[PDB]
Amino acid sequence: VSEAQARRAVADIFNSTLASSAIGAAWELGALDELRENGKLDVSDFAVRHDLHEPAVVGMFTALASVGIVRREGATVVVGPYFDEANHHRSLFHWLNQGSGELFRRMPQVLPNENRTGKFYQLDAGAISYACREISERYFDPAFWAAVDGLGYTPTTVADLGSGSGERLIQIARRFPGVRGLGVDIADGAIAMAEKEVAAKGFGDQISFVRGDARTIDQVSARGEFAEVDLLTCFMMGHDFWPRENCVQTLRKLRAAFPNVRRFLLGDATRTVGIPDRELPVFTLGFEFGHDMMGEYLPTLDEWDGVFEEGGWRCVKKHAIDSLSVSVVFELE
Amino acid sequence: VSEAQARRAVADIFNSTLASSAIGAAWELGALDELRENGKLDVSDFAVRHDLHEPAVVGMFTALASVGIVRREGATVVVGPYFDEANHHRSLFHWLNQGSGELFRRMPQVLPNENRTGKFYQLDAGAISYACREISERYFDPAFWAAVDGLGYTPTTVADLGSGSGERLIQIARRFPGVRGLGVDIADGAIAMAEKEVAAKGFGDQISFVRGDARTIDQVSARGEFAEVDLLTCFMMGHDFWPRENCVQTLRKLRAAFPNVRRFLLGDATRTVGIPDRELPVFTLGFEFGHDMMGEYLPTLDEWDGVFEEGGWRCVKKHAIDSLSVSVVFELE
Numbered sequence: 001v002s003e004a005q006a007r008r009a010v011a012d013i014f015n016s017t018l019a020s021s022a023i024g025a026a027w028e029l030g031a032l033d034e035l036r037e038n039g040k041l042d043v044s045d046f047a048v049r050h051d052l053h054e055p056a057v058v059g060m061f062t063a064l065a066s067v068g069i070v071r072r073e074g075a076t077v078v079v080g081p082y083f084d085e086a087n088h089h090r091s092l093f094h095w096l097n098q099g100s101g102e103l104f105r106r107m108p109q110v111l112p113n114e115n116r117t118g119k120f121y122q123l124d125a126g127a128i129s130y131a132c133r134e135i136s137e138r139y140f141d142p143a144f145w146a147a148v149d150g151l152g153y154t155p156t157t158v159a160d161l162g163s164g165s166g167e168r169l170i171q172i173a174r175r176f177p178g179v180r181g182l183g184v185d186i187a188d189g190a191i192a193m194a195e196k197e198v199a200a201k202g203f204g205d206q207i208s209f210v211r212g213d214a215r216t217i218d219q220v221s222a223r224g225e226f227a228e229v230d231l232l233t234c235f236m237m238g239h240d241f242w243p244r245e246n247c248v249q250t251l252r253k254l255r256a257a258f259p260n261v262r263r264f265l266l267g268d269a270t271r272t273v274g275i276p277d278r279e280l281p282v283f284t285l286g287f288e289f290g291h292d293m294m295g296e297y298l299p300t301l302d303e304w305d306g307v308f309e310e311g312g313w314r315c316v317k318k319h320a321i322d323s324l325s326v327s328v329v330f331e332l333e
Numbered sequence: 334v335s336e337a338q339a340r341r342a343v344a345d346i347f348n349s350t351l352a353s354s355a356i357g358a359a360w361e362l363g364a365l366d367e368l369r370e371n372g373k374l375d376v377s378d379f380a381v382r383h384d385l386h387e388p389a390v391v392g393m394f395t396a397l398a399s400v401g402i403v404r405r406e407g408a409t410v411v412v413g414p415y416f417d418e419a420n421h422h423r424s425l426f427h428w429l430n431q432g433s434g435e436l437f438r439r440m441p442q443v444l445p446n447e448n449r450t451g452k453f454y455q456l457d458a459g460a461i462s463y464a465c466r467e468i469s470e471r472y473f474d475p476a477f478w479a480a481v482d483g484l485g486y487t488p489t490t491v492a493d494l495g496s497g498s499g500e501r502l503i504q505i506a507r508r509f510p511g512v513r514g515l516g517v518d519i520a521d522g523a524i525a526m527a528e529k530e531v532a533a534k535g536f537g538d539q540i541s542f543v544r545g546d547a548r549t550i551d552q553v554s555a556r557g558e559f560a561e562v563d564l565l566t567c568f569m570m571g572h573d574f575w576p577r578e579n580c581v582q583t584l585r586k587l588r589a590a591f592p593n594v595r596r597f598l599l600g601d602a603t604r605t606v607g608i609p610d611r612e613l614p615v616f617t618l619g620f621e622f623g624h625d626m627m628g629e630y631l632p633t634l635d636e637w638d639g640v641f642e643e644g645g646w647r648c649v650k651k652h653a654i655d656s657l658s659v660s661v662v663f664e665l666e
């Protein structure tokens with residue numbers, strides 16, 4: 001490269017940092033949805049209607065324009081060449097920045113071994129959960145609902161591990177009227193939110209929750225509620241079962257604790273292998289690098305394939321996800 | 334563009350975020366310096382010598398590789414096509430990420446008018462100082478020393494506004510043996526660090542520090558020493574004198590409080606005008622957008638040029654900085 005191409009590419013990397021953060025902000029602030037509707041918006045009017053500091057709004061849109069997501073035209077912002085694709089993945093930018101941004105920012109302090117004890121990094125838990133809700137729906141839904149449609153039976157009681165919001169149980173309950181739901185979650189506030197939402201939507205006597213660690217499900221004393229369960233679901237947390245030896249034991253314990261489960265639908269993103277550095281897709285590098293910074297295990301697709309039998313399960317169908325790195329839904333029984 | 338081009342462009346945007354944050358980290362951890370000296374390093378060797386968590390180290394270089402700053406070949410990392418440019422500007426990336434990242438991450442919380450009271454954003458001050466030390470040396474020093482070389486007299490007492498770590502005063506004292514220095518800084522902590530630094534370097538009896546706000550310099554008590562000053566310097570903070578009416582009055586106050594000043598050397602970065610969005614150079618977008626988010630004024634070059642006479646000074650020479658957005662050093666008298 002000439003010196004001028006290098007100048008441009010490095011300016012682009014810099015401005016990309018700001019665009020990236022602005023994608024998640026423009027999502028959260030409602031700008032991306034206004035642009036989808038009308039293909040354009042008026043900067044001052046947007047600022048006034050949302051009661052925002054307008055010079056900062058102008059910077060937000062400039063950042064987006066600097067890399068081609070939007071285009072500024074006098075007083076208006078118009079969708080740009082990368083708008084549909086950036087908007088498609090917005091929840092992943094939000095996860096990277098608003099969610100995980102402190103982690104990455106603190107790279108020089110997280111890498112040194114002497115610092116890697118106790119609480120050595122900070123995530124924004126509320127932000128991560130704001131993004132994960134749309135990730136779950138946008139990337140995992142087609143395959144999740146394809147798996148539900150090949151169950152070959154009508155579930156009667158569904159249990160969801162890492163139930164969070166309760167949203168999956170509510171959606172299963174809208175599709176299977178009078179199905180019962182049970183959500184297991186390790187956080188009493190994820191439980192409290194889920195209970196409110198379920199009641200708010202008129203399901204408080206179909207769906208209940210239990211505080212519980214899915215990794216050691218034998219320590220939860222809801223046997224008998226567990227014994228009713230004929231469908232088990234676990235999305236976006238499977239990798240926390242690892243390393244391999246712990247995963248095997250978690251899987252065996254889940255098999256014992258839900259002895260009437262027919263299908264177990266397990267969905268997660270995985271560590272990729274061998275992708276060339278200049279062709280990394282969206283999400284991959286952040287997911288993998290983040291977990292390596294936090295010291296947390298991330299298995300590959302092959303590692304999952306290789307663990308089910310030892311863990312007490314048989315994989316009878318597997319769905320590729322589009323494309324949240326390499327992500328999958330396994331149908332186990 | 335095709336969907337493929339857009340897919341690629343949005344992925345690069347995502348990855349640039351991680352590479353961006355990695356530039357600063359790789360500076361601070363010593364990787365960029367090692368790669369500048371040898372053109373390459375060995376990832377495991379590097380991690381052992383620096384006692385870093387190697388999976389995170391690999392992640393760091395991978396980030397840098399994903400946008401062409403380095404290349405990975407087996408177990409080694411090698412300089413890539415944008416290495417010289419990114420290394421040149423590494424302190425700007427550090428400033429954006431390590432220093433200012435929490436500002437830009439919190440864009441959804443900082444933009445709403447109802448959040449904008451009290452402490453509504455958070456910068457990392459030690460990080461900002463670490464980066465500012467190199468920004469001063471790498472971008473400002475040549476114009477600074479040129480202005481010192483054209484003073485047309487030999488200073489006897491120098492005052493530095495926003496003295497920081499005391500480094501500029503130490504360097505002046507090395508240039509003019511026997512000159513006295515006086516640093517004014519608003520932050521007690523800068524005073525204490527500067528005093529320790531100066532004592533350690535042996536300039537304890539020549540350089541002193543007084544806590545005070547250069548925007549209200551008429552209120553700073555400095556044992557009558559201001560009247561002995563014959564050179565005044567102020568780098569990287571002049572924009573904090575603005576808006577214009579405050580700047581006029583601060584400049585008059587400085588003229589009256591340092592009546593024996595001959596030259597006043599003023600160096601700062603400025604707000605640009607009319608740069609096309611897709612042509613923003615490095616730094617420019619962050620510096621401007623950051624100040625707008627913070628609610629702080631940033632003047633253009635023309636605004637400076639047009640304030641001096643009313644403020645009681647004459648500009649007799651002006652130096653262009655090479656490329657820190659649009660930055661300059663004014664020589665005033």
Ligand SMILES: Nc1ncnc2c1ncn2[C@@H]1O[C@H](CSCC[C@H](N)C(=O)O)[C@@H](O)[C@H]1O
Pocket residue numbers: 132133136161162163164165168184185186187190212213214215234235236237240
């Ligand atoms: N070991 C564990 N046992 C139970 N819940 C867990 C867990 N590890 C994480 N969680 C919970 O699972 C959620 C992870 S996010 C996944 C949310 C949900 N499955 C969805 O598709 O949106 C959080 O609510 C967290 O509290």
Ligand SMILES: Nc1ncnc2c1ncn2[C@@H]1O[C@H](CSCC[C@H](N)C(=O)O)[C@@H](O)[C@H]1O
Pocket residue numbers: 465466469494495496497498501517518519520523545546547548567568569570573
């Ligand atoms: N109004 C004000 N009066 C005095 N010092 C100020 C100030 N606003 C900012 N500062 C100080 O200015 C320093 C800015 S960093 C710039 C440091 C130095 N002039 C250099 O070139 O390297 C900090 O220590 C901060 O405390």
Ligand SMILES: CO[C@H](c1ccccc1)[C@@H](O)C(=O)O
Pocket residue numbers: 128132135236237268269
């Ligand atoms: C908390 O959810 C996030 C997620 C994102 C994509 C796939 C799986 C999980 C992530 O921070 C996690 O590792 O659990």
Ligand SMILES: CO[C@H](c1ccccc1)[C@@H](O)C(=O)O
Pocket residue numbers: 461465468569570601602
């Ligand atoms: C703290 O120094 C920084 C700087 C960088 C370049 C030019 C001017 C100022 C910046 O955060 C500031 O506005 O004071």
Ligand SMILES: O=C(O)[C@H](O)Cc1ccccc1
Pocket residue numbers: 304305306308315316317318330
């Ligand atoms: O090994 C696998 O590929 C999957 O884990 C599940 C599977 C196996 C065989 C046939 C279909 C699905």
Ligand SMILES: O=C(O)[C@H](O)Cc1ccccc1
Pocket residue numbers: 637638639641648649650651663
């Ligand atoms: O107006 C200007 O450009 C500068 O602020 C100072 C200058 C003016 C005239 C000749 C030289 C320097």
Ligand SMILES: [Ca+2]
Pocket residue numbers: 040041042076
């Ligand atoms: Ca309009």
Ligand SMILES: [Ca+2]
Pocket residue numbers: 068069070071080081611
């Ligand atoms: Ca464009």
Ligand SMILES: [Ca+2]
Pocket residue numbers: 119120121122
């Ligand atoms: Ca921490």
Ligand SMILES: [Ca+2]
Pocket residue numbers: 279280281282340341344
């Ligand atoms: Ca791609």
Ligand SMILES: [Ca+2]
Pocket residue numbers: 373374375409
């Ligand atoms: Ca080597």
Ligand SMILES: [Ca+2]
Pocket residue numbers: 278401402403404413414
């Ligand atoms: Ca390359």
Ligand SMILES: [Ca+2]
Pocket residue numbers: 544545546549552553
């Ligand atoms: Ca004062």
Ligand SMILES: [Ca+2]
Pocket residue numbers: 635638
């Ligand atoms: Ca002019």
Ligand SMILES: [Fe+3]
Pocket residue numbers: 239240291296
């Ligand atoms: Fe995780």
Ligand SMILES: [Fe+3]
Pocket residue numbers: 572573624629
């Ligand atoms: Fe500033």
